[PDB]
Design a protein around this ligand. Structure first.
Ligand code: SAH
Length: 269
């Protein structure tokens, strides 16, 4: 079913991606994303760091950022850890050029995520796909490729738009062009059920691999579930929650996002 949904929806994902590949449209998307999603990005990073520590009882050694933009995630991670192997990939040359100007000890690659194996061979502890999964022409193929790059103790963490959150998404727009941008992005997005089906398809074909999907603000983990408690106790995630969307303004206008994990814990003989 999901393979069909993905294929028939391909034009919608092509249209969404125009907002990142043309200079004028890219100004609109960059402004919106940095104004509205920067806080979310911090929360998402602290979420995966906290999850990784709780799940594997160690810190990650390597992180790969898919659709890394101007390298904001990699910069955040670079200041957090003294030693960590960092890689970012993005198909926008302008984004990668900007990322390289940060002067960080990290590898930035300009290519379609499809081609990652031609650039990266070392296994990754965390592969992060933040607010860009709906832009890929072939998302099933991408994830299958990335699973091959996962280390012994690893996860793919995907955060993306929920198709059903369109109304709330539009409330955040501050211009008609932002409305147009968001409409195009949401048209490319999946429902929660479709997202869950997608992760089911890519994981049950893999040894030592489980998955989790949810709408909960904290990593999609239900507020009666186990990982939720570990996360809510985490000092770093708590810090991020305070000053991310901790302004006045009375209300926040928060569209619910999809949160997906592909978790690998290889058992050796
Ligand atoms: N096939 C592909 N491979 C790699 N990057 C892609 C891609 N399609 C789109 N992108 C990139 O995905 C990004 C979406 S916007 C930036 C998302 C970033 N992860 C963040 O959370 O802020 C753009 O920089 C765009 O150039």
């Amino acid at each position: 079913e999901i393979e069909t949904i993905v294929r028939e929806s391909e034009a919608n994902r092509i249209q969404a991606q125009t907002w990142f590949s043309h200079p004028e449209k890219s100004k609109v998307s960059f402004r919106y994303d940095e104004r509205e999603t920067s806080s979310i990005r911090s929360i998402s990073i602290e979420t995966f760091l906290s999850f990784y520590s709780s799940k594997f009882n160690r810190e990650p050694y390597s992180v790969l950022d898919i659709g890394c933009g101007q390298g904001q995630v990699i910069q955040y991670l670079n200041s957090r850890f003294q030693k960590i192997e960092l890689t970012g990939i993005d198909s926008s040359a302008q984004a990668i050029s900007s990322a390289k100007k940060l002067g960080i000890n990290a590898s930035f690659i300009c290519s379609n995520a499809e081609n990652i194996m031609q650039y990266v061979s070392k296994k990754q502890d965390i592969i992060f796909i933040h607010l860009c999964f709906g832009l890929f022409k072939n998302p099933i193929a991408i994830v299958n490729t990335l699973i091959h790059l996962l280390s012994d103790q690893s996860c793919i963490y995907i955060v993306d738009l929920d198709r059903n959150s369109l109304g709330e998404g539009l409330n955040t727009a501050q211009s008609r062009e932002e409305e147009a941008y968001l409409k195009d992005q949401y048209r490319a997005s999946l429902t929660m059920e479709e997202f869950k089906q997608l992760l089911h398809v890519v994981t049950k074909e893999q040894h030592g691999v489980s998955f989790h999907v949810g709408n909960s603000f904290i990593g999609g983990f239900d507020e009666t579930s186990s990982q939720f408690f570990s996360l809510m106790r985490n000092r770093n995630l708590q810090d991020a929650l305070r000053t991310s969307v901790g302004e006045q303004l009375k209300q926040s206008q928060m569209p619910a996002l999809l949160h997906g994990w592909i978790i690998k814990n290889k058992r050796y003989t």
